[PDB]
């Protein structure tokens, strides 16, 4: 933020909340809902080694 | 007189602790250290109902009060001004938080006080008064309602709204305060403009009056009519009740008579009062030397005290229920219980002002045809 530099980040966060960033659709929500019900890839090689 | 932003971002108000004529006291915290305090918010505009001369004079009065309390700060038994904030409409005065209320509720709940705490409060008040007089500063506003109590029975003077500096050689001719606490000199200033003025004597009279009202339980001078009360005060014929002070020492009564003197010159000062034997105490000393007459006198006094202690113990009377049938007021426990029960039954008609007072509850007068003669 460093003082007066705090405006453009506010504008970017507001645009991100709006839903579109230069023609790209975006979604925002809590991490717990997103991680739930999603495929997670497994790294099980360390257990064998 | 800094900006209100500092007060807004430094102190956060809390629930109300009390109310006044135009100001309310609220609790506040200091964010850096989390220390509790009490803040007095004064509305100089008076809710917008004040003509601007009134606002200006209130602002001048509060500025005089802050700059006169600035010098006095330092005494352990005085209120400490921690921070000041000024706006166009409000003054924020931050003092120490005490804990409980002032003397009125304590005296109402306990009816009357004993000599043990009386000695301490009188000593502290005399020390504060002597310190104030040494600084050439007067108060003219000792009332029991301006003395706060702590959890360890600590008293500090507050409400200096009438305090002002006294240039030496000057004689003030202003009249203020409750009429019951008005010294004869102030009232003489009222009737006659030729009187030179008054001084610290009004302070001694106020100390005597508060001592009287804490000891007896009722003010020495009080009546339903202001004019007759003023004539009562001018006469200076305070009397001692018969079945009320038969269990008090002679030294305290002598001190009572010494505090209240009509003549301003004969009134005792703080230094003279502090030297009375009532406050006498000893810690340790080994330079007691005298003649053999002194040894005989001391041994005779010891023997006399040892003999008298048993006889004083024997002078107690039983319950005497038959005497209760005749007269219950004679016995001290019966009197104290009747008084306390009467106070708790009728405890919410004692407030500020001359209209209602503690003396209105007691009726020691023999209600009869003698009530026809009241005044001229």
């Amino acid at each position: 933020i460093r003082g007066s530099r705090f405006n453009p980040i506010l504008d970017m966060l507001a645009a991100l909340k709006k839903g579109i960033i230069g023609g790209v659709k975006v979604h925002v929500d809590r991490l717990q809902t997103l991680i739930s019900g999603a495929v997670v890839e497994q790294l099980d090689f360390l257990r064998i080694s | 007189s800094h900006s209100a932003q500092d007060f807004y971002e430094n102190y956060e108000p809390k629930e109300i602790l009390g109310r006044g004529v135009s100001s309310v006291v609220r609790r506040c915290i200091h964010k850096p250290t989390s220390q509790e305090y009490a803040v007095k918010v004064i509305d100089v505009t008076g809710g917008g109902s004040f003509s601007p001369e009134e606002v200006r004079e209130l602002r001048e009065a509060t500025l005089k009060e802050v700059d006169i309390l600035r010098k006095v700060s330092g005494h352990p038994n005085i209120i400490q001004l921690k921070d000041t904030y000024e706006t166009n409409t409000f003054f924020f005065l931050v003092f120490d938080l005490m804990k409980r209320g002032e003397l009125f509720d304590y005296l109402t709940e306990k009816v009357t006080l004993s000599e043990k705490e009386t000695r301490k409060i009188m000593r502290a008040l005399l020390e504060v008064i002597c310190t104030l007089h040494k600084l050439n500063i007067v108060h003219r506003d000792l009332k029991p309602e301006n003395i706060l109590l702590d959890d360890n029975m600590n008293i500090k003077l507050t409400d200096f709204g009438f305090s002002c500096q006294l240039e030496p050689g000057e004689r003030l001719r202003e009249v203020c305060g409750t009429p019951s606490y008005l010294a004869p000199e102030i009232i003489e200033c009222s009737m006659n403009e030729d009187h030179p003025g008054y001084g610290k004597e009004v302070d001694m009279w106020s100390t005597g009056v508060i001592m009287y009202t804490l000891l007896a339980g009722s003010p020495p001078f009080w009546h339903r009519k202001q004019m007759l009360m003023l004539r009562m005060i001018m006469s200076g014929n305070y009397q001692f009740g018969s079945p009320e002070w038969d269990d008090y020492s002679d030294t305290v009564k002598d001190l009572v008579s010494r505090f209240l003197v009509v003549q301003p010159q004969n009134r005792y000062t703080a230094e003279e009062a502090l030297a009375h034997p009532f406050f006498q105490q000893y810690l340790v000393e080994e330079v007691r030397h005298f003649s053999p007459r002194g040894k005989f006198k001391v041994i005779a006094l010891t023997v006399l005290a040892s003999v008298r202690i048993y006889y004083q113990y024997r002078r107690v009377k039983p319950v005497t229920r038959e005497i209760v049938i005749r007269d219950p007021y004679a016995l001290r426990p019966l009197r104290r219980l009747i008084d306390a029960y009467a106070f708790r039954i009728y405890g919410h008609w004692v407030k500020k002002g001359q209209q209602q007072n503690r003396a209105a509850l007691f009726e020691n007068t023999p209600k009869a045809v003698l009530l026809s003669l009241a005044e001229e």
Binding site: - | G48, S49, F90, P328, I345, A368
Partner: protein
């Protein structure tokens, strides 16, 4: 691994204990034993262990077998959830009926059936009123959905849930039978308020604020909308009555559930430790804890074959309340939840000793332990000493499941953050403060010019065309359409008033911004908004109220349009109070909050906004002539009232030949002329004709009742005087107050006004209502008239005329004056005290102690038997009611005050002696003896006969009334002497008093 073995063992235990009677198809477990029923609360509570073990399985599965196990457990959970939801949805008609008015007959059944989902009992054979079960059901439904598990399928069920939300939203002012299905303390069930139901309801309403039921793949209309005023009202109610469960029970152990793992709704944790210490020190036993004092359930007395307890519970239900280990197994979870471990070990060790081992060697929780029928006398002398034996039903699935969940939590397989995804554990975190934003608008150009003259820059109603401002009643009419379905006969949310908490936040309706003014600037409802002082006062209290809680995100926003009525008499300047208030919320400090002003353009970028989706498209002629020709507002009101009462309730007067002028139209037009003159001489008169009602009167009444207080409407005497001991609906309240006020019309308005005055007064200063147990509006009114007559030295009619002409600020000031309490002096004060019967704080306790050592206290024939002391306790209300009734037989206030003084002097004098009188005491005789002694002493002194006067109907000298109580000549000495003489008169020739 060890974890696999432990979890397999726990699954085996759960399967052998609970899942063996899951009862598929319907999916509802039987309510234990051979009862063949299904209680909602037990069914809801029996699934927490399964849910927790399933969540434990899900995170560590990583294998087909454990994945399938978690799938099966989850599908069992959803099957039971849907089965229970079917019971609710099958009975929409009762919900619709209950949505309007409150009664037990249109309430939902509490015990549903097995297969075919039928009813087992009618509406008059069981207690069908339990808000706690429905609230806890919704709370676990919300938690279940937030966990990520689908329960809801169709969108119609969303409408049903929305309707049920309104069904339970009035729990703060609706009495219920209770969790125990036993009504009040004693039997013959009478519906009464309890803290447990509202404590459960608050969390359930909070949980469903925005939680969508369709998961992450929802739509525009998938979220349940709830208000916020009800939550804060419930919080205030629970805070007021937290220490005691209700007005009849000193404590109920069920308060633990509210202040533990389920439905955290509590603030100021000091109260939490206080109630925990109190319940520990009062209800702890040897092998369990009691529900509450003096419950006879499952006792060797009482004839369990019979119900409707006879009023003879003197000692047959004392110190023999059996036990309940459910509250014990609550303690282990409560301790293990936040940060406590040693207490958890202590409680686990204590509970392991009271366990019983059955088949296959598995834990089993007994219901209660009963006192042996023979060892009963010993317990009365040595409580909590005699051993007990198990007795009754003990497949208790509730406590068993709770203990299983607690053990699983303690083992560490599951984290506390998984049971509650909504993070309800941080309710004790303080919130520093909030900043309030206020915008000021001018109605017309003239007002804008006037404000700009004094240096205030405001903007008119125009020029902000994108932004529109409307009152709140249109917003209520808008909200009256949420969740409306025609096929299922659902009428949507009923009409109700709004708090200021709802109007502050901005709104969006069809790509448009709307702002709504607060409801207290409405002059079309009542006339208290015509006074500037009260406008200022309600602004101050409302700003304080918003600054206090503000549990929503974003800064508030308040619109305060300045009206034409806010100008002075000449209409060229605003009033001094309004200008002072404006200068006051300038500089950022007004009332008890920080106020920042500006323009709506800047507040738009930083303010909470709500998107709304459900409004998206899918000879009388001679009298009339006399009225027309005549003048004066007085005769105007008289003739309009006469015409309305006689022939003109809705008949057209035909006064104007072109427009049909109805009596109501003329009456409502007269308000415009009345308001300009500021004449409080007929505005109340016309308001009585139109019968205007003040909003939120029921809220004021329930706030009055929640303070352990009894209300009473009407002048004396009985039987037209009433007693409102329980909350009543708005229509019932209005009918009752109208019946009490009779045809005096203005009495109803005055009662409403004084009730509202008390209503905003007790919240600010709840300290002047001490020394009082019962208030009467009529008695206060007569005292007001008497005081005004004495002040003005006029007749009663002139005093009434002056009182009815006072501005409302004057009534508030005089009410405060007489509430503070601030010959002719002493007698007046004694009369006031007798009128307001301000009995001391510890009066009833002293009366009880004296009654303990005497046969009774006779007062002019009527006697109070000493047998009352053993069937009743000083803490409860009935003794106070009986004592006041006995003391209220005499009508003269001076008599009641002297009676109080004499009985109190009896109380003090009884302590000195140590004896039993064994006789009845006549207080009137003592008073007469004291009076005779006083008269004899005064005659002995030498007083002339004039001052020893006699009252026309007393036999008591007026100088005795004028006499002060204390002193060497006070009435206390005479009363004490008379009481001592009377005691000696009935004493065996020996006093033997020592102290």
């Amino acid at each position: 691994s060890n974890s696999g073995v432990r979890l397999d063992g726990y699954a085996r235990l759960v399967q052998q204990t609970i899942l063996c009677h899951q009862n598929p198809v319907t999916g509802l477990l039987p309510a234990s034993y051979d009862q063949k029923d299904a209680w909602v609360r037990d069914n809801v509570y029996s699934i927490l262990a399964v849910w927790g073990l399933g969540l434990a399985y899900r995170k560590n599965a990583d294998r087909d077998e454990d994945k399938a196990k978690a799938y099966e457990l989850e599908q069992s959970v959803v099957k039971l959830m849907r089965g229970l939801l079917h019971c609710m949805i099958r009975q929409v008609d009762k919900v619709e009926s209950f949505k309007y008015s409150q009664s037990t007959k249109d309430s939902l059944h509490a015990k549903y059936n097995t297969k075919t989902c039928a009813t087992v009992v009618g509406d008059d054979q069981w207690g069908h009123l339990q808000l706690d079960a429905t609230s806890v059901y919704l709370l676990f439904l919300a938690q279940m959905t937030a966990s990520g598990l689908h329960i809801i399928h169709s969108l119609d069920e969303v409408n049903f849930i929305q309707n049920l939300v309104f069904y339970i939203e009035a729990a703060y002012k609706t009495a219920d039978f209770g969790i125990w299905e036993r009504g009040d303390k004693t039997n013959q069930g009478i519906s009464e308020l309890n803290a447990s139901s509202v404590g459960m309801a608050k969390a359930a309403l909070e949980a469903l604020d925005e939680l969508d039921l369709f998961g992450v793949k929802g739509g525009p209309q998938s979220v349940i909308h709830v208000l916020a005023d009800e939550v804060q009202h419930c919080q205030s109610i629970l805070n007021s009555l937290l220490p005691r469960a209700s007005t009849s029970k000193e404590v109920d152990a069920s308060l633990l559930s509210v202040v533990s793992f389920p439905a955290f709704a509590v603030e100021d944790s000091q109260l939490v430790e206080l109630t925990k210490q109190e319940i520990i020190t009062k209800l702890q036993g040897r092998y369990g804890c009691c529900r509450f004092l003096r419950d006879g359930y499952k006792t060797p007395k009482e004839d369990p074959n019979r119900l409707y307890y006879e009023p003879a519970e003197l000692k047959l239900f004392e110190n023999i309340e059996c036990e309940w280990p459910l509250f014990w197994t609550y303690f282990i979870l409560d301790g293990v939840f936040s940060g406590n471990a040693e207490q958890v070990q202590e409680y686990k060790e204590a509970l392991e000793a009271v366990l019983i081992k059955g088949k296959n060697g598995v834990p089993l929780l007994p219901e209660l332990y009963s006192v042996p029928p023979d060892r009963v006398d010993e317990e009365y002398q040595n409580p909590h000493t005699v051993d007990r034996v198990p007795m009754g039903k003990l497949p208790h699935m509730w406590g068993q499941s709770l203990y299983i969940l607690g053990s699983l939590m303690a083992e560490g397989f599951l984290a506390p953050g998984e049971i509650d995804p909504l993070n309800r554990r941080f309710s004790t975190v303080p919130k520093p403060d909030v900043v309030v934003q206020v915008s000021i608008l001018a109605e017309t150009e003239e007002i804008k010019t006037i404000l700009k003259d004094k240096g205030i820059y405001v903007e008119t109603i125009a020029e902000v065309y994108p932004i529109r401002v409307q009152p709140a009643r249109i917003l209520s009419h808008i909200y009256s359409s949420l969740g409306c379905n025609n096929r299922m006969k659902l009428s949507g949310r009923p009409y109700r008033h709004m708090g200021v908490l709802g109007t502050s936040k901005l709104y969006d309706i069809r790509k448009t911004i709307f702002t709504f003014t607060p409801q207290f600037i409405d002059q079309q409802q009542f006339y208290l908004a015509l006074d500037n002082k009260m406008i200022v006062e309600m602004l101050r209290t409302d700003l304080s109220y918003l600054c206090s809680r503000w549990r929503m995100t974003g800064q508030p926003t308040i619109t305060f349009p300045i009206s034409h009525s806010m100008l002075d008499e000449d209409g060229t300047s605003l009033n001094s109070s309004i200008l002072a208030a404006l200068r006051k919320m300038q500089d950022g400090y007004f009332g008890g909050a920080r106020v920042q002003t500006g323009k709506l353009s800047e507040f738009l970028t930083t303010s909470c906004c709500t998107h709304l989706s459900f409004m998206d498209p899918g000879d009388f002629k001679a009298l009339v002539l006399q009225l027309k020709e005549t003048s004066s507002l007085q005769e105007q009101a008289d003739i309009l009232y006469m015409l309305y009462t006689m022939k003109g309730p809705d008949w057209n007067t035909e006064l104007y030949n072109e427009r049909s002028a109805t009596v109501r139209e003329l009456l409502t037009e007269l308000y415009g002329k009345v308001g300009e003159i500021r004449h409080w001489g007929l505005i109340r008169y016309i308001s009585g004709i139109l019968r205007k009602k003040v909003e939120a009167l029921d809220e004021a009444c329930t706030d009055l009742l929640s303070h352990q207080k009894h209300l009473t409407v009407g002048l004396p005497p009985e039987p037209r005087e009433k007693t409102i001991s329980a909350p009543l609906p708005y229509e019932a309240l209005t009918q009752l107050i109208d019946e009490a006020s009779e045809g005096d019309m203005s009495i109803s308005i005055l009662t409403q006004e004084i009730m509202v005055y008390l209503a905003m007064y007790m919240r600010t200063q709840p300290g002047l209502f001490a020394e009082m147990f019962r208030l009467r509006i009529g008695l206060i009114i007569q005292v007001m008239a008497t005081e005004l007559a004495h002040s003005l030295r006029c007749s009663a009619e002139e005093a009434t005329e002056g009182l009815m002409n006072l501005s409302p600020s004057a009534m508030k000031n005089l009410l405060h004056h007489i509430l503070s309490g601030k010959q002719g002096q002493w007698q007046r004060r004694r009369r006031l005290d007798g009128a307001l019967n301000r009995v001391p704080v510890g009066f009833y306790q002293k009366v009880w102690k004296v009654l303990q050592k005497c046969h009774g206290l006779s007062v002019e024939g009527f006697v109070l038997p000493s047998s009352t002391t053993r069937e009743m306790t000083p803490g409860e209300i009935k003794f106070s009611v009986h004592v006041e009734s006995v003391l209220n037989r005499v009508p003269q206030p001076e008599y009641r005050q002297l009676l109080v003084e004499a009985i109190l002097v009896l109380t003090m004098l009884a302590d000195i002696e140590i004896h039993s009188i064994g006789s009845i005491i006549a207080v009137e005789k003592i008073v007469h003896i004291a009076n005779d002694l006083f008269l004899q002493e005064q005659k002995t002194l030498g007083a002339d006969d004039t001052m020893l006067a006699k009252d026309p109907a007393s036999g008591i000298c007026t100088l005795l009334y004028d006499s002060a109580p204390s002193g060497r000549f006070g009435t206390m000495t005479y009363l004490s002497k008379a009481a001592a003489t009377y005691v000696q008169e009935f004493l065996p020739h020996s006093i033997c008093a020592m102290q």
